[PDB]
Design a protein around this motif. Structure first.
Motif, PDB file in Angstrom:
ATOM      1  N   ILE A 200      -0.719  -2.150   7.544  1.00 23.39           N
ATOM      2  CA  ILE A 200      -1.846  -1.954   6.645  1.00 23.39           C
ATOM      3  C   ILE A 200      -2.394  -0.574   7.000  1.00 23.39           C
ATOM      4  O   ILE A 200      -2.711  -0.314   8.160  1.00 23.39           O
TER       5      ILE A 200
ATOM      6  N   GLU B 186       2.393  -2.905  -4.856  1.00 26.82           N
ATOM      7  CA  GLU B 186       1.959  -4.219  -4.400  1.00 26.82           C
ATOM      8  C   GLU B 186       1.054  -4.869  -5.440  1.00 26.82           C
ATOM      9  O   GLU B 186       0.090  -4.265  -5.910  1.00 26.82           O
TER      10      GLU B 186
ATOM     11  N   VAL C 126      -1.446  -6.263  -5.653  1.00 27.83           N
ATOM     12  CA  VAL C 126      -2.801  -6.437  -5.140  1.00 27.83           C
ATOM     13  C   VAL C 126      -3.790  -6.874  -6.211  1.00 27.83           C
ATOM     14  O   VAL C 126      -4.699  -7.659  -5.939  1.00 27.83           O
TER      15      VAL C 126
ATOM     16  N   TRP D  11      -3.491 -10.433  -6.922  1.00 31.62           N
ATOM     17  CA  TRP D  11      -4.097 -11.196  -5.840  1.00 31.62           C
ATOM     18  C   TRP D  11      -5.610 -11.174  -5.929  1.00 31.62           C
ATOM     19  O   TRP D  11      -6.271 -12.077  -5.432  1.00 31.62           O
TER      20      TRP D  11
ATOM     21  N   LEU E 169      -7.434 -12.779  -2.144  1.00 32.39           N
ATOM     22  CA  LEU E 169      -7.390 -11.752  -1.106  1.00 32.39           C
ATOM     23  C   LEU E 169      -8.726 -11.683  -0.368  1.00 32.39           C
ATOM     24  O   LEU E 169      -8.769 -11.642   0.855  1.00 32.39           O
TER      25      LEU E 169
ATOM     26  N   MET F 158      -9.210 -15.055   1.689  1.00 34.43           N
ATOM     27  CA  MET F 158      -8.426 -15.171   2.902  1.00 34.43           C
ATOM     28  C   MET F 158      -9.063 -14.393   4.058  1.00 34.43           C
ATOM     29  O   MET F 158      -9.143 -14.909   5.173  1.00 34.43           O
ATOM     30  N   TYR F 159      -9.534 -13.175   3.795  1.00 36.05           N
ATOM     31  CA  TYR F 159     -10.170 -12.360   4.838  1.00 36.05           C
ATOM     32  C   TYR F 159     -11.543 -12.892   5.273  1.00 36.05           C
ATOM     33  O   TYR F 159     -11.952 -12.720   6.421  1.00 36.05           O
TER      34      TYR F 159
ATOM     35  N   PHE G 100      -3.357 -18.433  -0.415  1.00 35.39           N
ATOM     36  CA  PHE G 100      -3.196 -17.000  -0.646  1.00 35.39           C
ATOM     37  C   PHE G 100      -1.766 -16.521  -0.378  1.00 35.39           C
ATOM     38  O   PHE G 100      -1.169 -15.815  -1.200  1.00 35.39           O
ATOM     39  N   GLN G 101      -1.217 -16.899   0.774  1.00 35.37           N
ATOM     40  CA  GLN G 101       0.140 -16.504   1.134  1.00 35.37           C
ATOM     41  C   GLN G 101       1.177 -17.100   0.193  1.00 35.37           C
ATOM     42  O   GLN G 101       2.202 -16.475  -0.087  1.00 35.37           O
TER      43      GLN G 101
ATOM     44  N   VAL H 260       1.110 -14.886  -2.811  1.00 28.88           N
ATOM     45  CA  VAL H 260       1.764 -13.603  -2.553  1.00 28.88           C
ATOM     46  C   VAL H 260       3.258 -13.791  -2.732  1.00 28.88           C
ATOM     47  O   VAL H 260       3.933 -12.965  -3.344  1.00 28.88           O
TER      48      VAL H 260
ATOM     49  N   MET I 162       5.756 -11.836  -5.234  1.00 25.82           N
ATOM     50  CA  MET I 162       6.846 -11.071  -4.660  1.00 25.82           C
ATOM     51  C   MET I 162       8.145 -11.507  -5.307  1.00 25.82           C
ATOM     52  O   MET I 162       9.058 -10.704  -5.500  1.00 25.82           O
TER      53      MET I 162
ATOM     54  N   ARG J 179       6.327  -3.229  -0.369  1.00 23.79           N
ATOM     55  CA  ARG J 179       6.296  -4.509   0.337  1.00 23.79           C
ATOM     56  C   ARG J 179       7.322  -5.431  -0.312  1.00 23.79           C
ATOM     57  O   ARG J 179       7.919  -5.084  -1.332  1.00 23.79           O
TER      58      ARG J 179
ATOM     59  N   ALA K 153       6.224 -10.308   3.812  1.00 23.51           N
ATOM     60  CA  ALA K 153       5.195 -11.339   3.688  1.00 23.51           C
ATOM     61  C   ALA K 153       5.553 -12.512   4.596  1.00 23.51           C
ATOM     62  O   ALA K 153       4.679 -13.144   5.201  1.00 23.51           O
TER      63      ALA K 153
ATOM     64  N   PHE L 237       3.473 -11.023   7.885  1.00 31.28           N
ATOM     65  CA  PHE L 237       2.176 -11.629   7.590  1.00 31.28           C
ATOM     66  C   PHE L 237       2.030 -13.134   7.792  1.00 31.28           C
ATOM     67  O   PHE L 237       1.030 -13.578   8.348  1.00 31.28           O
TER      68      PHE L 237
ATOM     69  N   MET M 114      -0.022 -14.883  11.056  1.00 31.51           N
ATOM     70  CA  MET M 114      -1.066 -15.884  10.835  1.00 31.51           C
ATOM     71  C   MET M 114      -0.798 -17.209  11.541  1.00 31.51           C
ATOM     72  O   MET M 114      -1.713 -18.016  11.761  1.00 31.51           O
TER      73      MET M 114
ATOM     74  N   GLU N 297      -9.834  -5.565   3.015  1.00 31.33           N
ATOM     75  CA  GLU N 297      -9.188  -5.345   4.308  1.00 31.33           C
ATOM     76  C   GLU N 297      -9.889  -4.387   5.263  1.00 31.33           C
ATOM     77  O   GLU N 297      -9.347  -4.063   6.317  1.00 31.33           O
TER      78      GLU N 297
HETATM   79  C1  LIG Z   1       2.246  -8.426   1.528  1.00 26.33           C
HETATM   80  C2  LIG Z   1       0.959  -8.989   2.107  1.00 26.33           C
HETATM   81  C3  LIG Z   1      -0.212  -8.178   2.178  1.00 26.33           C
HETATM   82  N1  LIG Z   1      -1.327  -8.729   2.701  1.00 26.33           N
HETATM   83  C4  LIG Z   1      -2.588  -7.937   2.836  1.00 26.33           C
HETATM   84  C5  LIG Z   1      -2.494  -6.563   3.462  1.00 26.33           C
HETATM   85  C6  LIG Z   1      -3.688  -5.865   2.787  1.00 26.33           C
HETATM   86  O1  LIG Z   1      -5.100  -6.157   3.206  1.00 26.33           O
HETATM   87  C7  LIG Z   1      -3.270  -6.235   1.324  1.00 26.33           C
HETATM   88  C8  LIG Z   1      -2.192  -5.429   0.509  1.00 26.33           C
HETATM   89  O2  LIG Z   1      -1.789  -4.283   1.175  1.00 26.33           O
HETATM   90  O3  LIG Z   1      -3.044  -7.627   1.543  1.00 26.33           O
HETATM   91  C9  LIG Z   1      -1.321 -10.013   3.127  1.00 26.33           C
HETATM   92  O4  LIG Z   1      -2.403 -10.484   3.608  1.00 26.33           O
HETATM   93  N2  LIG Z   1      -0.229 -10.794   3.074  1.00 26.33           N
HETATM   94  C10 LIG Z   1       0.903 -10.316   2.577  1.00 26.33           C
HETATM   95  O5  LIG Z   1       1.957 -11.100   2.537  1.00 26.33           O
END
Ligand SMILES: Cc1cn([C@H]2C[C@H](O)[C@@H](CO)O2)c(=O)[nH]c1=O
Ligand SMILES: Cc1cn([C@H]2C[C@H](O)[C@@H](CO)O2)c(=O)[nH]c1=O
Lengths: 192, 197
Positions: free
Chosen positions: A18, A41, A43, A46, A55, A58-59, A69-70, A73, A77, A94, A99, A103, A107, A161
């Motif tokens: 990141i 990506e 994004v 998401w 997104l 999750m954070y 969330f995953q 993704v 993908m 990516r 992932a 990622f 986790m 992020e």
């Molecule tokens: C590809 C991927 C990115 N991310 C995050 C990284 C960043 O904060 C954002 C995309 O760059 O999401 C994930 O949390 N899981 C993933 O599988």
């Protein structure tokens, strides 16, 4: 007969931690749309899951949203990895591999994903790699430093992020190394 | 194009509410496995996911487990729908449709699945219907009133679902009705309706 067979040209996978400069990098192709299939990506998908920002969720609370969330993704993908194109060159930011290998794995190690949740994601990945073709010819690894990456993030006008601990970037960095370095074609670039 | 397209024989889906007598009904087909692909509901996999029992976890903590559980249900169901077979007939207990139109929908309504979780599951269902091929030529619906279903679950050994409130079976019942009787959903086949009595 894996979904999306003979319909995928040479595919380049842009990988990196990141804040490793993947966005700025892919922008050089921003003017090659007329010739190459450039997939950044997902994004935005998401951030807009029919109204929900997975997104951001999750954070703000990993143990509750990392799983859904995953899982999303992965789907985005997969849609990109199998999307139809007329071009003869595909460049993706990516991939389903990062992932998964980076990622999701991360986790699991840090506790964000409990056993059952992780297993569910892995089962989905196993099925995918057995019933779906993922075109991955070349891999461009933007190797960086946890510190440098941590800085580039703090600099930008980040959002979701922005509040990520340096340790998170360290664990992620190691996973990318173990996968792209310590064991297809991978072209490492000093992204500093 | 669509995955598993042209590899599936005539397929029959057995559907019904919890405690509608589906496991008993399907047993009578066992002596035909010789010419029939009999795929029972992957409950064994849901009880044992690399050691974890998602079905149990889901019933003890809906708010937290409905999401990962329904996700895996989707998967195992997707595996059954696309599994290879040389038989000319295939009978499946429940399906990817019952998971979507009944079970997941009800878990969204009663709060078990929060909007972000429901949408993720929904997105996979939309991507799947656009790609993966899902054979369905007939559905045999074992219609049963919630009262009778509840009573049947009551008289059997204690399982994870043994605790469902009558209200719950009542909700699933209307959802199967709206799907297989009032045809409010965009289903893909004829429906034969049998009675439990
Ligand atoms: C590809 C991927 C990115 N991310 C995050 C990284 C960043 O904060 C954002 C995309 O760059 O999401 C994930 O949390 N899981 C993933 O599988
Ligand atoms: C198919 C399916 C079954 N179930 C439940 C019903 C029972 O308790 C058991 C198998 O019939 O699992 C779900 O909770 N969701 C589903 O999508």
């Amino acid at each position: 007969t894996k979904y999306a067979e003979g319909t995928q040209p040479f595919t380049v996978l842009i990988e990196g931690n990141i804040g490793s400069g993947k966005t700025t990098y892919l922008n050089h192709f921003e003017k090659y749309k007329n010739d190459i299939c450039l997939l950044t990506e997902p994004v935005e998908k998401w951030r807009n899951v029919n109204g929900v920002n997975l997104l951001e969720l999750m954070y703000k609370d990993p143990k509750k949203w990392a799983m859904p969330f995953q899982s999303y993704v992965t789907l985005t993908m997969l849609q990109s990895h199998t999307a139809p194109t007329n071009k003869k060159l595909k460049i993706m930011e990516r991939s389903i591999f990062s992932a998964r290998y980076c990622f999701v794995e991360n986790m699991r190690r840090n506790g964000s994903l409990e056993q059952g949740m992780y297993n569910t994601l892995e089962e989905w990945y196993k099925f995918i790699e057995e019933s779906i073709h993922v075109q991955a010819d070349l891999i461009i690894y933007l190797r960086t430093s946890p510190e440098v990456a941590y800085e580039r993030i703090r600099q930008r006008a980040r959002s979701e992020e922005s509040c990520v601990p340096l340790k998170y970037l360290q664990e992620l960095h190691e996973l990318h190394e173990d996968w792209l370095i310590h064991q297809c074609k991978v072209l490492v670039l000093d992204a500093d």
